[PDB]
Each structure stands twice: as structure tokens, then as C-alpha cells.
Ligand binder design. Structure first.
Ligand SMILES: Nc1ncnc2c1ncn2[C@@H]1O[C@H](COP(=O)(O)OP(=O)(O)OP(=O)(O)O)[C@@H](O)[C@H]1O
Ligand SMILES: O=C(C[C@@H](c1ccccc1)C(C(=O)O)C(=O)O)c1ccc(C(F)(F)F)cc1
Ligand SMILES: [Cl-]
Ligand SMILES: [Cl-]
Ligand SMILES: [Cl-]
Ligand SMILES: [Mn+2]
Ligand code: NA
Ligand code: NA
Length: 284
């Protein structure tokens, strides 16, 4: 038996604070809701800018994708609202900012930290892919950290609810070869990005690097990268099983029977998967 279905906020309901970050079309601001004293990260878009650059569909898409997500390792969308000039997304506040910030400052994560944060990302992707959603812009800048230093994956403007997807979106360093050669992405495209990220955690920079996107693309499609010395051996093996040109041969992909075999990789031997979000992360 189904009953009938079960108040939009306004800018004035908040006190706004510092800018937490910026994107091409967005400014993210820390805000406190006056009625509850809860802090939120509010992502704000200028309608005029969204309209001029033909981005209207990706605003609605971001809201609709995030509305589906309720996993510990994803930023949560609590509310949306608009006024005459702006669009507002009320997000959970990830107090410790971008994973990228820590890679930059520290340069390289130790093996325990690499294993732990890789596991959290794997866990997050298993959930996302289980819902038939691909992220398409997975990268350390979009992996935030909450007050307890657990990951909070964000930025679903490029996400796609699915198989294959045809838009050319993402960030060059993390773009999959199939998106370059087949002009389409799939869930396995996020596993390619995962491999790039693991390599970055250990080596300091992602594996295909250049100051020009074209140069990066040429290397991606030829699998032109190599490992530095001292790269943790089990992480190397895992990266080699993710950075595979054939998207149907990547550990974790549907054609390779999904996340069980990926979580079973020897790199994760010591990982207790069931309660990762309740564990204390290793110190960076
Ligand atoms: N929920 C949050 N908590 C804390 N900081 C955040 C949050 N969301 C975004 N930020 C900060 O703002 C930055 C930009 O946010 P986001 O990545 O969602 O913007 P975007 O407009 O989609 O970026 P781009 O246009 O470059 O793709 C983030 O990298 C982060 O530094
Ligand atoms: O999707 C909406 C309104 C939509 C919204 C979506 C994301 C963030 C904030 C609000 C809004 C709605 O009323 O549908 C809401 O959820 O409160 C929208 C998208 C683009 C434009 C414009 F073209 F102006 F840019 C306007 C509204
Ligand atoms: Cl404002
Ligand atoms: Cl504030
Ligand atoms: Cl670049
Ligand atoms: Mn974005
Ligand atoms: Na999971
Ligand atoms: Na982003």
C-alpha cells in the first residue's frame, strides 16, 4: 500500500564563510545554517554562466545522480535551491579538503596509507558501479577528506547513469584510452583512473604527465609510462592490472567479474573491508 508522497531553503537561511574551492563554473563556500548551526559546503553556480556555456543539463544531472547516493565515502547532497541569479547545492562539508593537498605536501604516501586510501576508493567505486553510475572524473582533486580523514568522493557533474557513455569529459591525466580511441567510456574507465591514482599516491605524480593535454593523450593510447624505483611491489602489480588498454581486461571490471577479485588482490591482504568507514585511518 502506497500513501501520498511525504520547504526549499534560501540564501538568507545561512551565514556564509570562506571559499573552500572553485571550479570552472562553480564556487564552493562554507556555510552555517542559522536554524540548525550545521555546516555545509554549498556549491554555487551562476545561471548566466551555465546558460552561456550550454551546461544546463549537467546541473540537473549532478543533482539527480547525487540524490541516489547514500554511502559513507561520498559527499552527500542534502538540499538544492535557486534564486534569480544562482543555483545552490547543499553538500556535506569535507573539513580536510582535497586528497591532492596531502600528496602535494607529503609527496608520497607510505604503504599503509596507500593501501588504506586505495581500499576506501575501491569500496566507493564498487558501490557507485553497483548503482550503474560512472564517475568519469575520478582524481585526487575530487576525493575529499572529512574530519576523521575518511574519503568523500565528490563532483558528479560529469557522472553518467548507464553500457557505454559518449561525452568527452574528464581530466587529461586520468582519461582512459577507450575514451580517446573508442570515443566512449564505461565503468572500467573509472578503474583506469584508479590505477592512475594509486600510481600517484606512491610516485607523487600520475603516470602520464605533460604540460600539454595532447602529449598526455599520445602516451595514454600507447601505454607509455614506467615505474620509478622502490615502487611497492604489490601496488605495482595492481597498477599493472588496472592500466590495461583493453577495458574488458582490467581487474574490477564486469568482464573480469567485478569487485570481488579486485578486493582479493594481495595488496589488500591486510584490509578489513566490512567496516572501513569506522576504522581509524593511518596517519599521513
Ligand atoms: N563538499 C565539500 N567540502 C569541502 N570542500 C569542497 C566540497 N566540494 C567542493 N569543495 C572544494 O571546492 C573545489 C571545487 O569543487 P568541485 O570539484 O565540486 O567543483 P567543480 O565546479 O565541479 O570543479 P571543475 O569545474 O574544476 O570540475 C573542490 O576541489 C574542493 O576543494
Ligand atoms: O535544475 C535546475 C533547478 C533545480 C536545481 C538543480 C540543481 C541545483 C539547484 C537547483 C531546482 C528545481 O526547482 O528543480 C532544485 O532542485 O531546487 C536549474 C538548472 C539550470 C538553470 C539555468 F538554466 F538557469 F541555469 C535553472 C534551474
Ligand atoms: Cl550568495
Ligand atoms: Cl561559516
Ligand atoms: Cl595538463
Ligand atoms: Mn565538476
Ligand atoms: Na562497496
Ligand atoms: Na572537480
Amino acid at each position: 500500500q502506497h500513501a501520498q508522497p511525504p520547504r526549499k531553503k534560501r540564501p538568507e537561511d545561512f551565514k556564509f564563510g570562506k571559499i573552500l574551492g572553485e571550479g570552472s563554473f562553480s564556487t564552493v563556500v562554507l556555510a552555517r545554517e542559522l536554524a540548525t548551526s550545521r555546516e555545509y559546503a554549498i556549491k554555487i553556480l551562476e545561471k548566466r554562466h551555465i546558460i552561456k556555456e550550454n551546461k544546463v543539463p549537467y546541473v540537473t544531472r549532478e543533482r539527480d545522480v547525487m540524490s541516489r547516493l547514500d554511502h559513507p565515502f561520498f559527499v552527500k547532497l542534502y538540499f538544492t535551491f535557486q534564486d534569480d541569479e544562482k543555483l545552490y547545492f547543499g553538500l556535506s562539508y569535507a573539513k580536510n579538503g582535497e586528497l591532492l593537498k596531502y600528496i602535494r605536501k607529503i609527496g608520497s604516501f607510505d604503504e599503509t596509507c596507500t593501501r588504506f586510501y586505495t581500499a576506501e576508493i575501491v569500496s566507493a567505486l564498487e558501490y557507485l558501479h553497483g548503482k550503474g553510475i560512472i564517475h568519469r572524473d575520478l582524481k585526487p582533486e575530487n576525493i575529499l577528506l572529512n574530519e576523521d580523514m575518511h574519503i568523500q568522493i565528490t563532483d558528479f557533474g560529469t557522472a553518467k547513469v548507464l553500457a557505454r557513455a559518449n561525452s568527452f569529459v574528464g581530466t587529461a591525466q586520468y582519461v582512459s584510452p577507450e575514451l580517446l580511441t573508442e570515443k566512449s567510456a564505461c565503468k572500467s574507465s573509472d578503474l583506469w583512473a584508479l590505477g592512475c591514482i594509486i600510481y600517484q599516491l606512491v610516485a607523487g605524480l600520475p603516470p602520464f604527465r605533460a604540460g600539454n593535454e595532447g602529449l598526455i593523450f599520445a602516451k595514454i593510447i600507447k601505454l607509455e609510462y614506467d615505474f620509478p624505483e622502490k615502487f611497492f611491489p604489490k601496488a605495482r602489480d595492481l597498477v599493472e592490472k588496472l592500466l590495461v588498454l583493453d577495458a574488458t581486461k582490467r581487474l574490477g571490471c564486469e568482464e573480469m567479474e567485478g569487485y570481488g577479485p579486485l578486493k582479493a588482490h594481495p595488496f589488500f591482504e591486510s584490509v578489513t573491508w566490512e567496516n572501513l568507514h569506522q576504522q581509524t585511518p593511518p596517519k599521513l
